[PDB]
Amino acid sequence: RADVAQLTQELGTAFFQQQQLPAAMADTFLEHLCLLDIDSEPVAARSTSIIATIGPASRSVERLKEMIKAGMNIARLNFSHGSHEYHAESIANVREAVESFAGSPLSYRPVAIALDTKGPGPGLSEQDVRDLRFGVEHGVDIVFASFVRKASDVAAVRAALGPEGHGIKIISKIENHEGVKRFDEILEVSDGIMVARGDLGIEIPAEKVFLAQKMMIGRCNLAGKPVVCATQMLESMITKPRPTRAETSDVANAVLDGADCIMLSGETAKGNFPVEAVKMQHAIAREAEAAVYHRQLFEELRRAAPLSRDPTEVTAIGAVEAAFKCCAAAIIVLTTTGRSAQLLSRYRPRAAVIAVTRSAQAARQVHLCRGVFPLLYREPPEAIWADDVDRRVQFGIESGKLRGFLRVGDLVIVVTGWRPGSGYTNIMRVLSIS
Amino acid sequence: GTAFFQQQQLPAAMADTFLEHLCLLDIDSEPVAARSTSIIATIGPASRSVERLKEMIKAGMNIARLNFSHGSHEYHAESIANVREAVESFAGSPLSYRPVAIALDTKGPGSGPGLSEQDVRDLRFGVEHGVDIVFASFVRKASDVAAVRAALGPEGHGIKIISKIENHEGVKRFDEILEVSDGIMVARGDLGIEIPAEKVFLAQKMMIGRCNLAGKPVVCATQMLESMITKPRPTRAETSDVANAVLDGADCIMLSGETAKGNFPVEAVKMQHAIAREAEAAVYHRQLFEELRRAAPLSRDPTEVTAIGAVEAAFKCCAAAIIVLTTTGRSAQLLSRYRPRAAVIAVTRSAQAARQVHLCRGVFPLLYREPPEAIWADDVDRRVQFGIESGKLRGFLRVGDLVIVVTGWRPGSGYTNIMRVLSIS
Amino acid sequence: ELGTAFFQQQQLPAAMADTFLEHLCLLDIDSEPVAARSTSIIATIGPASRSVERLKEMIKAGMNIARLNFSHGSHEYHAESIANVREAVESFAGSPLSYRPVAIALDTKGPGPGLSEQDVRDLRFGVEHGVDIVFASFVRKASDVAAVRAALGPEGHGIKIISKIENHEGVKRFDEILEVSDGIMVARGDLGIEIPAEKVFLAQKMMIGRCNLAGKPVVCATQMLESMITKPRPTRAETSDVANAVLDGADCIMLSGETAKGNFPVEAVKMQHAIAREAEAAVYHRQLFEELRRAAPLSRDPTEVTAIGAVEAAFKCCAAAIIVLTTTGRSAQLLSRYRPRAAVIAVTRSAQAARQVHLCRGVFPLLYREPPEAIWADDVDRRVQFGIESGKLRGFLRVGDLVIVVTGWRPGSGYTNIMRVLSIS
Amino acid sequence: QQQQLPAAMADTFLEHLCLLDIDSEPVAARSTSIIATIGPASRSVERLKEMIKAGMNIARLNFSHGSHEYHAESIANVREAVESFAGSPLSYRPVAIALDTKGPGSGLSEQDVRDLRFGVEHGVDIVFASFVRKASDVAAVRAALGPEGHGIKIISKIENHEGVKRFDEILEVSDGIMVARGDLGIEIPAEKVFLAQKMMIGRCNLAGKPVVCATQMLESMITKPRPTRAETSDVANAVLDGADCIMLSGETAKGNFPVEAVKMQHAIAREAEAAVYHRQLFEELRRAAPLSRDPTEVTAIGAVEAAFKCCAAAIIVLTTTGRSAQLLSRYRPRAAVIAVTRSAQAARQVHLCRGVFPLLYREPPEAIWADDVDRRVQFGIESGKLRGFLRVGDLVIVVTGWRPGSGYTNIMRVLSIS
Ligand SMILES: O=C(O)CNS(=O)(=O)c1cc2c(cc1O)C(=O)c1ccccc1C2=O
Ligand SMILES: O=C(O)CNS(=O)(=O)c1cc2c(cc1O)C(=O)c1ccccc1C2=O
Ligand SMILES: O=P(O)(O)OC[C@H]1O[C@](O)(COP(=O)(O)O)[C@@H](O)[C@@H]1O
Ligand SMILES: O=P(O)(O)OC[C@H]1O[C@](O)(COP(=O)(O)O)[C@@H](O)[C@@H]1O
Ligand SMILES: O=P(O)(O)OC[C@H]1O[C@](O)(COP(=O)(O)O)[C@@H](O)[C@@H]1O
Ligand SMILES: O=P(O)(O)OC[C@H]1O[C@](O)(COP(=O)(O)O)[C@@H](O)[C@@H]1O
Ligand SMILES: O=C([O-])C(=O)[O-]
Ligand SMILES: O=C([O-])C(=O)[O-]
Ligand SMILES: O=C([O-])C(=O)[O-]
Ligand SMILES: O=C([O-])C(=O)[O-]
Ligand SMILES: [K+]
Ligand SMILES: [K+]
Ligand SMILES: [K+]
Ligand SMILES: [K+]
Ligand SMILES: [Mg+2]
Ligand SMILES: [Mg+2]
Ligand SMILES: [Mg+2]
Ligand SMILES: [Mg+2]
């Protein structure tokens, strides 16, 4: 009460009733559950990304525009089906639908393109090598590598991407007992992980999949690397317009577990309700994110994270701590590769991480990190570097004010570096919105 | 031994943080403990055969639900008789006999304001046929619970009333409903139509948490393994839903169409049994017990005081079980509210209490049938010995195990006050 | 119930705090201590406190252990002091409200390498005169304790050896010394000369913490109320020092020159009594009990398992006392290690155990000398009732209070396995 | 490792105590300020120079004794001794001057009005107001300091039952508190003073306001060269309780060993500060501190969190009034708070806040404000290196503002030394 009394007088009682704030202020996890309220509405923008598998039900440019508006952040192309010609047309339709909103920063919404490989079916397959080369040639952002069983499998995928695919992210799919057992070595060499529950549920007893999902999500959260929860999340929506009680619960629990992304497979690739499936995941993720017990989560991420002498890492924890202290509406970060936004995201701030970048690939790939909202800055550089920096911060403060994220009177945390180029983030500023 | 500490997610249970607890979960760590979350199976055309109900009892069914929204009193009386016939077909082996509670799920009020006239007739049918529990549909306020209690009359004083929360009013008036109810059912089917579907998980977790705090049974119900009505295996979302209901703190999990009308009634029970054992081992008891202790108020009731001392003692020695003598089941319920990892073996002479304690997680009822000894202390020991012998036969106990024994100072209900540390011989 | 006034006394608002910082903020000078003083006072007996009349005044002021410093005087001098202590103690054997057992402790002169020749003669004197405790000077390694143990000859294996840590070697080899000792004395006088004076507080807090972890008695000694050797009131630093030794976790606090040679021996005892009562109420039991619990390893010893269950039960109902039957004092010691707020009333037939349990904080001994009953269960009930009657007589209990009773299942030492919740009638 | 780092890494307070090591040496600079009462035993300029070297940070003038002429000579001798080290600006130590009032005796007395006026005329930094028993007593002292004494700090002395009972209202209107144990131990039972001390220290820590522990801390050292075991324990426990300052009264004013008493408090405080269980302390201070929309308050918590993440050697903060350094100090960082200020009064007063090391900036301004700021930050680094706080390769947190003037702190920077 006294630790929120002056902020309650300032922001009002109605502010503290929304986005499960009474449940977030609880002293125990049990009290946190007791304080969850169906009448407490989510205010924050949805932070868990939705990956939609693109197929016959979601191929058209008009349908893809509907899915972008519904919340799709990553388009998945399953190379276990179709052909190179089929997937190239899908890629072109996604890019056409994405560029139909390029007229403004207030309307632009980047969509990453992910290639899900067919898999080994011994080691790296010959069609996997051909498909990975297709991905490099078509400019894919992410590879969902099927049946990764050891660290050498991810090294083989990296080698097959060649020197031109150095920027592509490799998300290793854990689909069998070997992948689960060798998880630490796979995560160490991967950019992220996908909990591929379809095959995992056949390879290990179905009643043990939840243990593997929660363990992998927890370790990925500890490592600060993206983790995707996949397969049968809203399965019944392939034929029905509404999901089952188990399905909405599953989506909410994947977000509560700590998943950075949630996925739709047949629900969007072949189902009768692809847009509705995206809308449903969007709705559940917004509710589940507000119900996250940040008080224990942030304390545990701080206690578990080792000490660091990397200024980006040090600035990120100071910025997230500052954002929680004032209930900052957003954390605006300037990033080239997306790394500074990723280091902010690993501490799970409630404040939106608005990442301003000049890299179109980084803007698409940061969708893998929960709570990161990418803004592609296209303006030519200013003669004075410090003015160019300030212009990019103001671009985020304007796009944020104008897209609801921010309001006059709000506090924002601004994360920048001391010199140009990747790797120099070391400054945190507290700014009041006017 | 080292192998003991690698099983039942003991490395994950020893973790200092919840995050480290999740990281330490092991798919190769096998569950050793008996399944403690009760399975309620709805009876219907797919599960009325005496021989099919015997298979469901062996699979793990603990409570048989009679849905009074379907069928006549004649139909429900036959369900009751077939359940009792299947249950009594195992009474020849008293150390391995499993009591099965009978629950009457009411039709509800409909466009009505309170207790319907059909509900009054069905509630009286339940009292006349000896039902143990009432799952009262669409409870919206405390006066709805009082009307159900009044309709049960003086002969139904022992029947438990589990209020079903199925709409926004029930969720908003939850505290007053829980106060006058014996427990709650999160009726997700109607709740998911009455409130936005994407909010049901918030209502489920809130109600389970409050019930855990109150020490009253909470049931998670509807569509848990829905696809198993026609398919032999459930979806990844369904197994996750069952596991998460157990992790949330549900005392009971339910099957509706999966057992009443589906093609896999036995397999649906076996699947819930398998998931619940895995999920119970993954419970982070270190935080859970500390939070239940911190939140529970001080008490001057000896049953309540003995229960917390016994659960604390069970954790200190990794007791295989807590054997409790109970008349009404209340001493077992007060042990269960602290969520011990040790099984609560409840020895009772009341067949109704033996059936009703299935509402409390981790309570394993043993119905004692022997005629009393003339010396009271000798009769209490004979029942404790019966608890140990059944525990050994069922795999709960072995020679060398430590067990906590909970008894009272005089006969009759309400006098539990002793906790003793016992070594199994 | 208990009333609002009950919850304002003995720093109960500060004890209910969720953080240690909030606990400090809630400390109230107007919140009066209700509980009996639980930290024992050791008074050094010398010229200023040698007379039978003066010793009677010191017993009334709160002296629990009489220390005889064998660094001064002779065997003849100390034998007269022992006889005067026993005479003063027995002058209250008619009044059950005034009778209090007083332990007799021999503080050795000290070492050279191994045990000194004078220490062998003095330890032999202690065995012949029936001393209860040995404060072994300058213990530096485990072999020093073994030498004292061997010197305690065939008739003295029951005497307790409290090793005095007085130098850098004793501090560095602390774990091996504590392992073989019955307890520790933080001998700050020599320690403050052997190591830098500004480091003594680190050694005191470390040794007290480790002793609390081990469940072994720890004494805080030297210059606690030094100025009271010549002045009737202590300094602000002295009262703070006594209070902080109690807050650190000391089982005993000591007076040296303050009682042996000073002008105000009775007043020094009265002052330590007054400060310890205040400091014990200010102990943050919520964190302390949770940390003692979390740090203590799992145990398969029924005495250790019963002790934690009993202390948990005592906290749950705000038990007025924990009555324990003990022949060696071990069951009372295992209760004391969990630092209950309830008084541990130890009923024993052993006069030596009754004197030695003063080393354990919160243990209030009662020597029982009635002839044994033919039925053991009746003999147990008679001693439990003796503990309740003495409790009512001394102010610990009233009709309507709840107590926790700790007994075992069969006679003789080592079988404590029972905890009962009893209502005072 | 050094500075009780194994004990600081412990998961419980019990294991923290068990891990305390007498062989683990303190590395960090002493954070708890020492207030020494100046009198006949510590009046000479030569004696005062030795007390400054021993660790004296605040000179207390007890207006219950002596005269205005006597105390004016003491003030002049303190200033003379302090300025005798001004030739080396990177290692010069500011010393605050505090006036302890006589008190009301049998409201604000007429002698107190004259003494408070003396303090304003002589430029004192702090007032230790005797026998404060309600918020209106603080207001009367504030009024008696007139318009020329707006910048003096008022530390209310709690010396009786009424002051203890009305503590919250007194702390609300005061700059800080002094636990005046001498009178408090006569006004309330002696065995209850420790409860009042620990309660007041805790509440002051919560409020982020300075708290002084005073009277009889090393009493025996008035006549003996070494203190008793109870005295060293008392000093260590006042620091462990959370006191920002510790005081010497008769030990320095009339005692045979004034320099040794200061040296002893310095030695004990360094040991006690290393034994502080920061893991629990920071988590409790952070949890208890309310949410804030003030950028100085928000930057302060972000900076302390960042300092703990990298084991920052120091937090260099630019301050005009000392407020930005005070807001850093309230979170009890292990990193030294090096406060670079151009105000000489702020530099002296900032000794009331634990862990704040004031550096008086006596360098000429740079034309560009961004450059003036960078030279004040380089000044902090250079003094830190010279005084042993910093080494090349160390990480520091730099707390600066967006525009000049008090109240605009909003920037935290992670900087690598050289
Ligand atoms: O992993 C699985 O096997 C199932 N799930 S899916 O990846 O979402 C999926 C992908 C696809 C199609 C359906 C479908 O459900 C499809 O009809 C199709 C038809 C023609 C070409 C490609 C596809 C194609 O890639
Ligand atoms: O040495 C320490 O550790 C502390 N000193 S003490 O043990 O409290 C102490 C004991 C004694 C006397 C004084 C005194 O201070 C005494 O005068 C005396 C006179 C004649 C015979 C015995 C004593 C005797 O035992
Ligand atoms: O997040 P990354 O990839 O490390 O890049 C962050 C970088 O962006 C900046 O804020 C601005 O740099 P640029 O001028 O290269 O865009 C740098 O100061 C910082 O090093
Ligand atoms: O849990 P309940 O219903 O309160 O029953 C516990 C009761 O059972 C007993 O242990 C045994 O009593 P009975 O001999 O009547 O079965 C009583 O001492 C105790 O009061
Ligand atoms: O603390 P100790 O020395 O183990 O004594 C406890 C013993 O006292 C008893 O409670 C009673 O024993 P006695 O009848 O022999 O005195 C035993 O059952 C128990 O083992
Ligand atoms: O501690 P204070 O009193 O708030 O002052 C800190 C001030 O120091 C600055 O960093 C620089 O101070 P100057 O006015 O001396 O340039 C300001 O931007 C900031 O407001
Ligand atoms: O391979 C997959 O994507 C799966 O099994 O879910
Ligand atoms: O009544 C039920 O079981 C429901 O609505 O879910
Ligand atoms: O003997 C003692 O007590 C000492 O040396 O402190
Ligand atoms: O003036 C003081 O400091 C006191 O009275 O304690
Ligand atoms: K695939
Ligand atoms: K029904
Ligand atoms: K001695
Ligand atoms: K004064
Ligand atoms: Mg697959
Ligand atoms: Mg329904
Ligand atoms: Mg000695
Ligand atoms: Mg005074």
PDB file of N, CA and C in Angstrom, chain A residues 3 10 295 299 302 305-309 314-315 318 321-322 325-326 347 409 411 426-431, chain D residues 283 286-287 289-293 295 298-299 301-302 305-306 308-310 331 393 395 410-414:
ATOM      1  N   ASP A   3       4.028   1.512  -0.578  1.00  0.00           N
ATOM      2  CA  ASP A   3       4.983   1.395  -1.684  1.00  0.00           C
ATOM      3  C   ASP A   3       4.351   1.720  -3.072  1.00  0.00           C
ATOM      4  N   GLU A  10      -1.245   9.783  -8.056  1.00  0.00           N
ATOM      5  CA  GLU A  10      -0.855  10.346  -9.348  1.00  0.00           C
ATOM      6  C   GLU A  10      -1.526   9.699 -10.572  1.00  0.00           C
ATOM      7  N   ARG A 295       6.928  -9.684 -10.320  1.00  0.00           N
ATOM      8  CA  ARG A 295       7.686  -9.490  -9.082  1.00  0.00           C
ATOM      9  C   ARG A 295       8.628 -10.660  -8.815  1.00  0.00           C
ATOM     10  N   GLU A 299      12.899 -10.798 -10.102  1.00  0.00           N
ATOM     11  CA  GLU A 299      13.824 -11.138  -9.006  1.00  0.00           C
ATOM     12  C   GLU A 299      14.600 -12.412  -9.301  1.00  0.00           C
ATOM     13  N   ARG A 302      17.160 -11.820 -12.145  1.00  0.00           N
ATOM     14  CA  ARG A 302      18.294 -11.101 -11.528  1.00  0.00           C
ATOM     15  C   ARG A 302      19.179 -12.045 -10.689  1.00  0.00           C
ATOM     16  N   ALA A 305      20.875 -14.659 -13.168  1.00  0.00           N
ATOM     17  CA  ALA A 305      21.818 -14.132 -14.152  1.00  0.00           C
ATOM     18  C   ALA A 305      23.162 -13.847 -13.475  1.00  0.00           C
ATOM     19  N   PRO A 306      24.257 -14.268 -14.122  1.00  0.00           N
ATOM     20  CA  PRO A 306      25.576 -14.020 -13.523  1.00  0.00           C
ATOM     21  C   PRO A 306      25.990 -12.555 -13.647  1.00  0.00           C
ATOM     22  N   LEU A 307      26.995 -12.149 -12.856  1.00  0.00           N
ATOM     23  CA  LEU A 307      27.524 -10.792 -12.946  1.00  0.00           C
ATOM     24  C   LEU A 307      28.131 -10.564 -14.326  1.00  0.00           C
ATOM     25  N   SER A 308      28.069  -9.325 -14.824  1.00  0.00           N
ATOM     26  CA  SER A 308      28.572  -9.074 -16.172  1.00  0.00           C
ATOM     27  C   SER A 308      29.390  -7.850 -16.275  1.00  0.00           C
ATOM     28  N   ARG A 309      30.438  -7.909 -17.093  1.00  0.00           N
ATOM     29  CA  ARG A 309      31.268  -6.734 -17.343  1.00  0.00           C
ATOM     30  C   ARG A 309      31.022  -6.176 -18.763  1.00  0.00           C
ATOM     31  N   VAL A 314      24.881  -4.685 -18.660  1.00  0.00           N
ATOM     32  CA  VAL A 314      24.751  -3.851 -17.471  1.00  0.00           C
ATOM     33  C   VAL A 314      23.702  -2.749 -17.674  1.00  0.00           C
ATOM     34  N   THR A 315      23.692  -2.112 -18.850  1.00  0.00           N
ATOM     35  CA  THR A 315      22.734  -1.048 -19.141  1.00  0.00           C
ATOM     36  C   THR A 315      21.329  -1.609 -19.205  1.00  0.00           C
ATOM     37  N   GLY A 318      19.864  -2.149 -15.690  1.00  0.00           N
ATOM     38  CA  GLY A 318      19.593  -0.844 -15.102  1.00  0.00           C
ATOM     39  C   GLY A 318      18.351  -0.210 -15.703  1.00  0.00           C
ATOM     40  N   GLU A 321      15.164  -2.141 -14.518  1.00  0.00           N
ATOM     41  CA  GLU A 321      14.923  -1.788 -13.122  1.00  0.00           C
ATOM     42  C   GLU A 321      14.270  -0.397 -13.042  1.00  0.00           C
ATOM     43  N   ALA A 322      14.766   0.554 -13.848  1.00  0.00           N
ATOM     44  CA  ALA A 322      14.253   1.913 -13.909  1.00  0.00           C
ATOM     45  C   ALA A 322      12.825   1.916 -14.451  1.00  0.00           C
ATOM     46  N   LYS A 325      10.416   0.786 -11.724  1.00  0.00           N
ATOM     47  CA  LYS A 325      10.327   1.801 -10.675  1.00  0.00           C
ATOM     48  C   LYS A 325       9.287   2.869 -10.955  1.00  0.00           C
ATOM     49  N   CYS A 326       9.161   3.286 -12.208  1.00  0.00           N
ATOM     50  CA  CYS A 326       8.235   4.354 -12.585  1.00  0.00           C
ATOM     51  C   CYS A 326       7.058   3.895 -13.423  1.00  0.00           C
ATOM     52  N   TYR A 347      15.052  -9.717 -19.438  1.00  0.00           N
ATOM     53  CA  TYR A 347      14.616  -9.383 -18.083  1.00  0.00           C
ATOM     54  C   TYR A 347      13.094  -9.227 -17.950  1.00  0.00           C
ATOM     55  N   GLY A 409       2.964  13.025 -20.265  1.00  0.00           N
ATOM     56  CA  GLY A 409       3.052  12.756 -18.840  1.00  0.00           C
ATOM     57  C   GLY A 409       3.698  11.421 -18.522  1.00  0.00           C
ATOM     58  N   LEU A 411       6.512   8.329 -18.553  1.00  0.00           N
ATOM     59  CA  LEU A 411       7.948   8.257 -18.432  1.00  0.00           C
ATOM     60  C   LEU A 411       8.415   7.156 -19.359  1.00  0.00           C
ATOM     61  N   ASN A 426      25.595   1.746 -23.767  1.00  0.00           N
ATOM     62  CA  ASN A 426      26.082   1.971 -22.398  1.00  0.00           C
ATOM     63  C   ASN A 426      25.340   3.101 -21.665  1.00  0.00           C
ATOM     64  N   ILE A 427      24.278   3.649 -22.255  1.00  0.00           N
ATOM     65  CA  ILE A 427      23.560   4.788 -21.673  1.00  0.00           C
ATOM     66  C   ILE A 427      22.069   4.512 -21.507  1.00  0.00           C
ATOM     67  N   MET A 428      21.534   4.946 -20.380  1.00  0.00           N
ATOM     68  CA  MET A 428      20.132   4.833 -20.023  1.00  0.00           C
ATOM     69  C   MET A 428      19.650   6.230 -19.604  1.00  0.00           C
ATOM     70  N   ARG A 429      18.570   6.752 -20.230  1.00  0.00           N
ATOM     71  CA  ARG A 429      18.009   8.068 -19.901  1.00  0.00           C
ATOM     72  C   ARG A 429      16.566   7.967 -19.473  1.00  0.00           C
ATOM     73  N   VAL A 430      16.164   8.717 -18.446  1.00  0.00           N
ATOM     74  CA  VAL A 430      14.773   8.774 -18.016  1.00  0.00           C
ATOM     75  C   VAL A 430      14.197  10.034 -18.638  1.00  0.00           C
ATOM     76  N   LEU A 431      13.209   9.896 -19.523  1.00  0.00           N
ATOM     77  CA  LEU A 431      12.602  11.058 -20.181  1.00  0.00           C
ATOM     78  C   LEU A 431      11.112  11.182 -19.882  1.00  0.00           C
TER      79      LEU A 431
ATOM     80  N   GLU D 283      17.497  -5.978  -1.712  1.00  0.00           N
ATOM     81  CA  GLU D 283      16.182  -6.490  -2.083  1.00  0.00           C
ATOM     82  C   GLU D 283      15.074  -5.903  -1.205  1.00  0.00           C
ATOM     83  N   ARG D 286      14.786  -2.007  -2.076  1.00  0.00           N
ATOM     84  CA  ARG D 286      14.102  -1.889  -3.346  1.00  0.00           C
ATOM     85  C   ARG D 286      12.615  -2.213  -3.209  1.00  0.00           C
ATOM     86  N   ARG D 287      12.251  -3.328  -2.536  1.00  0.00           N
ATOM     87  CA  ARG D 287      10.852  -3.738  -2.352  1.00  0.00           C
ATOM     88  C   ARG D 287      10.060  -2.687  -1.585  1.00  0.00           C
ATOM     89  N   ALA D 289      10.838   0.652  -1.074  1.00  0.00           N
ATOM     90  CA  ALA D 289      10.808   2.003  -1.642  1.00  0.00           C
ATOM     91  C   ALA D 289       9.663   2.119  -2.584  1.00  0.00           C
ATOM     92  N   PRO D 290       8.866   3.194  -2.490  1.00  0.00           N
ATOM     93  CA  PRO D 290       7.688   3.290  -3.356  1.00  0.00           C
ATOM     94  C   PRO D 290       8.026   3.578  -4.799  1.00  0.00           C
ATOM     95  N   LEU D 291       7.074   3.316  -5.697  1.00  0.00           N
ATOM     96  CA  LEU D 291       7.239   3.648  -7.107  1.00  0.00           C
ATOM     97  C   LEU D 291       7.344   5.173  -7.231  1.00  0.00           C
ATOM     98  N   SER D 292       8.109   5.637  -8.210  1.00  0.00           N
ATOM     99  CA  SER D 292       8.325   7.067  -8.336  1.00  0.00           C
ATOM    100  C   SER D 292       8.328   7.519  -9.737  1.00  0.00           C
ATOM    101  N   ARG D 293       7.802   8.723  -9.975  1.00  0.00           N
ATOM    102  CA  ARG D 293       7.808   9.340 -11.296  1.00  0.00           C
ATOM    103  C   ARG D 293       8.882  10.448 -11.406  1.00  0.00           C
ATOM    104  N   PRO D 295      12.583  11.533 -12.132  1.00  0.00           N
ATOM    105  CA  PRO D 295      13.741  10.953 -12.844  1.00  0.00           C
ATOM    106  C   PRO D 295      14.997  10.765 -12.013  1.00  0.00           C
ATOM    107  N   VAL D 298      14.291   7.482 -10.121  1.00  0.00           N
ATOM    108  CA  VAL D 298      14.318   6.393 -11.087  1.00  0.00           C
ATOM    109  C   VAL D 298      15.749   6.096 -11.565  1.00  0.00           C
ATOM    110  N   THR D 299      16.547   7.124 -11.842  1.00  0.00           N
ATOM    111  CA  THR D 299      17.926   6.937 -12.289  1.00  0.00           C
ATOM    112  C   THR D 299      18.755   6.333 -11.183  1.00  0.00           C
ATOM    113  N   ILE D 301      17.900   4.224  -8.708  1.00  0.00           N
ATOM    114  CA  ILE D 301      17.721   2.790  -8.531  1.00  0.00           C
ATOM    115  C   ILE D 301      18.326   2.017  -9.716  1.00  0.00           C
ATOM    116  N   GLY D 302      18.202   2.544 -10.931  1.00  0.00           N
ATOM    117  CA  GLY D 302      18.805   1.920 -12.106  1.00  0.00           C
ATOM    118  C   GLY D 302      20.320   1.885 -12.000  1.00  0.00           C
ATOM    119  N   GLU D 305      21.386  -0.712  -9.277  1.00  0.00           N
ATOM    120  CA  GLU D 305      21.172  -2.045  -9.825  1.00  0.00           C
ATOM    121  C   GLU D 305      22.314  -2.392 -10.800  1.00  0.00           C
ATOM    122  N   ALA D 306      22.692  -1.426 -11.656  1.00  0.00           N
ATOM    123  CA  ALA D 306      23.775  -1.582 -12.631  1.00  0.00           C
ATOM    124  C   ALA D 306      25.117  -1.766 -11.923  1.00  0.00           C
ATOM    125  N   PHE D 308      25.677  -3.118  -8.932  1.00  0.00           N
ATOM    126  CA  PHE D 308      25.729  -4.464  -8.374  1.00  0.00           C
ATOM    127  C   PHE D 308      25.943  -5.533  -9.472  1.00  0.00           C
ATOM    128  N   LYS D 309      25.359  -5.338 -10.659  1.00  0.00           N
ATOM    129  CA  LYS D 309      25.498  -6.260 -11.792  1.00  0.00           C
ATOM    130  C   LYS D 309      26.945  -6.448 -12.262  1.00  0.00           C
ATOM    131  N   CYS D 310      27.736  -5.368 -12.262  1.00  0.00           N
ATOM    132  CA  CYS D 310      29.123  -5.439 -12.727  1.00  0.00           C
ATOM    133  C   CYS D 310      30.158  -5.305 -11.619  1.00  0.00           C
ATOM    134  N   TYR D 331      19.865   3.341  -1.333  1.00  0.00           N
ATOM    135  CA  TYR D 331      19.830   1.953  -1.783  1.00  0.00           C
ATOM    136  C   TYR D 331      21.052   1.135  -1.328  1.00  0.00           C
ATOM    137  N   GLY D 393      40.754  -0.510 -15.951  1.00  0.00           N
ATOM    138  CA  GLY D 393      40.031  -1.750 -16.176  1.00  0.00           C
ATOM    139  C   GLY D 393      38.772  -1.881 -15.338  1.00  0.00           C
ATOM    140  N   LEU D 395      34.999  -0.889 -13.773  1.00  0.00           N
ATOM    141  CA  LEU D 395      33.786  -0.308 -14.342  1.00  0.00           C
ATOM    142  C   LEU D 395      33.195   0.678 -13.331  1.00  0.00           C
ATOM    143  N   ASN D 410      19.016  12.428 -14.796  1.00  0.00           N
ATOM    144  CA  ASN D 410      18.199  11.484 -15.564  1.00  0.00           C
ATOM    145  C   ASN D 410      19.049  10.508 -16.417  1.00  0.00           C
ATOM    146  N   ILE D 411      20.396  10.545 -16.283  1.00  0.00           N
ATOM    147  CA  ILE D 411      21.289   9.732 -17.109  1.00  0.00           C
ATOM    148  C   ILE D 411      22.192   8.821 -16.296  1.00  0.00           C
ATOM    149  N   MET D 412      22.294   7.568 -16.726  1.00  0.00           N
ATOM    150  CA  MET D 412      23.207   6.618 -16.112  1.00  0.00           C
ATOM    151  C   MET D 412      24.044   6.013 -17.232  1.00  0.00           C
ATOM    152  N   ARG D 413      25.371   6.042 -17.067  1.00  0.00           N
ATOM    153  CA  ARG D 413      26.298   5.567 -18.085  1.00  0.00           C
ATOM    154  C   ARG D 413      27.222   4.525 -17.495  1.00  0.00           C
ATOM    155  N   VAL D 414      27.528   3.475 -18.262  1.00  0.00           N
ATOM    156  CA  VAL D 414      28.484   2.465 -17.823  1.00  0.00           C
ATOM    157  C   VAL D 414      29.812   2.830 -18.481  1.00  0.00           C
TER     158      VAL D 414
END
